[model samples]
Target: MKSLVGVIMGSTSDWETMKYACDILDELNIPYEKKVVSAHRTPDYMFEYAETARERGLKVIIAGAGGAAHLPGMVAAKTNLPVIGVPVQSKALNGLDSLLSIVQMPGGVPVATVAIGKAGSTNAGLLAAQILGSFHDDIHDALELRREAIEKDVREGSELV
Candidate 1:
């Protein structure tokens, strides 16, 4: 199936954190394409990716970046498709810088920023699925099943503890 979600990160190093998003998408059976596209190192490619995203049939974009973390905001500027920003924890600022950079976009341009590291990446995937679910009943059903399974796990694990 063609990807409805596009997952891009600043570098291959971010794959450790960004993979969580892809994992969740896989679990939900949501098709997504992943790539390494840096905003600072590859600005022109970033612009082209964002500009062509909608026409390529992408409904949501999940961008993970650390430090400056401009990929999400820059992509949002170029495309009308909803962009979710996952702030990867950085060695210097521990992802605080990533979070602020992603969340502090100007009034007009918006990137739905999530938390830092793995948690944020996971939620980005879920959020992408939810966004698509708003329009597709099958996707909505899959999300509900995922939520129920997690809730069941919590209940079972609490009894064990």
Candidate 2:
């Protein structure tokens, strides 16, 4: 009942990249749950997870996958919840196909897509936090702090260069 964010990947292999999402959630104290849900291999589970997500008290879902990368779109199809797609870096196409697979969704089903690999996952979490921040004051405060911290770091780093 506490978990508000659902972090699902096509497989554990995507964890390397998807971990950043969890890192942000952790930093912001946003309760979240993570699991392996494959669109191609475990179709039933993916649908079940998405269909039951809202009832389970989930506010957002961050899905990461490589190769065909249908996990996010499939999850989006099954649920009206906001789906953030992270294209895990693939060995074959260097993640170009993975990015394309996620970003090219149909008219009705919209999957919010980020970059490829870790940066994308990081932004996915930030985006989710932003969505939550719209209504939650605590989340908005945390986000503001993070933004200020990053700005300070960037401003200081320029002096060292």
Candidate 3:
């Protein structure tokens, strides 16, 4: 089966922060593959994965990393597929460095950067779905359902403090 979204993190340790991406994808019933690919320790693997990602049926990549996170930028350099970056909240600087590293990629190499931590991961998944839905009608229907659910959630929540 073709996967429309790829969820990648700097390390397995980052999974705690990246799981929100998984949650959103699951809620949307979006097919996705998850991997831990470090830009520093596994450069060659990252290169190979990104180079082959599009051909292997991945349309969008959601990458989450902390500290001097380079996974998103590096992957963007290798693949033509759109990459959405989530800056995992780091122990130091609270992921500012990670956010900057991902957001400040040179002009040609661009990664659409999201906020830090779970919010970023969640939006990354949603954005990836939107991007895929732009071309796939089946996914578009699913996305519309998700949006309606969100509206229902908000309406119900508004009854609370």
Candidate 4:
């Protein structure tokens, strides 16, 4: 099956946070491709990846980065595909810098920025799936089922508490 989502991180270290995104996608049976493509370290590769993403059948791009997080915005600038940004918590600012950098894109270009670290990464996966689900009924059904399961868990937890 063709992958509809592209998950890219600035470095392999970012995988510690990015894995959540992949895990969620896996649970949803959503085909996705993950890569380590840094805006700073691999500029040409990043540009090329974004440039060819739509033609390669990608519907969404999820990019996670720390510190000077430019991958998401840069990817959005390169492609018309919707880009989701996950701020990987950084040692210096605990991902605040990353969050600001990603969320503060100028007019026209947009990156749907999520929170910092694991929660953000996980949500990026769900958000990507939701975007695809808008057009694909099978995906929408799967998402509804997942939501019901989560709501059930929340209800059970509340009862226990």
Candidate 5:
């Protein structure tokens, strides 16, 4: 399927955390593509991907990386398309480094950084869909249905007295 969202991570190691983003996209019925595009290892490729993303039909780019993460910010810098950053939990600092690296982009360039690890990946997918939901009626309806299910689960959990 043609991709409306681009899912990228710094390395194969980050995929364990990044797959949650794909899961959400699948659940939302949003067309997307995933890849391991390292900023450090392949800076040229990263720039090329970001620079061409708009013309390639990607409405949003979700970049997940850990420790000295620069994928999201750099992608954001290269393209005007909204970029969402997911901080994969790293070993030594437990992903604080990753979180800060992503969240601290300088003014004028923005990477919407989410929570660390799986939650972040999951939300990145949902948020990407929401960005499109504003203009796409199908996406809007799907989001409403998805949100309803979450509200139902929350309401049911409240009955645990």
Candidate 6:
């Protein structure tokens, strides 16, 4: 089964931070689409996008946003689909504001949060892949290889640096 994961950022500038997710997802051969949807600037669009994401063939949504990040929670509010939030590190609190905003969702609504920047975005992709792999053998194998590659990298690094 083909998994369609949506990778979204608050702005084009956030792409620099969110690209880590794209890289990891692409490495696993997982199909993903990326876009910029500012929660503050495009609230209506964000709502519509999340509400129709599943019907439009998106299985998971990875949202990365900085300062007062509300994209993830807003998206989760509109859909039942799994939403992964990545707190893009900000220039001020270094993403602490973004991280808290994304993670402190109320009981009824939940957004699985990642770390504080690139690493968080990357894990969001991997987690989405694993979630999809739970049902697809081909994807599971691909994800397994991706996981092994990380271990292999460490092993190879030990021999070199």
Count clashes in each candidate, considering only residues at least 3 apart in sequence or on different chains.
0, 0, 0, 0, 0, 0
Tell me the TM-score of each prediction against the true structure: 0.97, 0.97, 0.92, 0.97, 0.96, 0.93
Residue 95 displacement (Å), model 3: 1.1
lDDT of each: 0.96, 0.95, 0.90, 0.96, 0.94, 0.91
**Clashing residue pairs in candidate 6 (N, C-alpha, C atoms within 3 angstroms):** none
**Clashing residue pairs, candidate 5?**
none
What is the model-wide C-alpha lDDT for candidate 4?
0.96
Candidate 6: deviation at residue 34, Å?
Answer: 1.1
What are the clashing pairs of model 1? none
Identify the runs in model 3 with alpha carbons over 4 angstroms from their true place.
Answer: none
Indicate the worst ten consecutive residues by lDDT in candidate 1: 152-161
Model 3, span 76-152: residue lDDT tens? 99999999999999897999998998899988998999999888988898889889789878778988987898899
Report the Cα lDDT for residue 24, model 2.
95
lDDT of 4 by residue, 4-120 (tens): 999999899999999999999999899999999999999999999999999999999999999999999999999999999999999989999999999999999999999999999
- Residue-level lDDT of model 1, residues 125-159, one tens digit each, is 99999999999999999999888998998988896
lDDT of 1: 0.96
lDDT of 5 by residue, 1-161 (tens): 88999999989989999999999999988999998889999999999999999999999999998999999999999999999999999999999999999999999999999999999999999999999999999998999998999899999898768
Q: How accurate locally is residue 34 in candidate 4, as Cα lDDT from 0 to 100?
A: 97
- Ten consecutive residues with minimal summed lDDT in candidate 2? 152-161
What C-alpha lDDT does candidate 2 achieve relative to the native structure? Answer: 0.95
lDDT score, candidate 6, position 26: 88
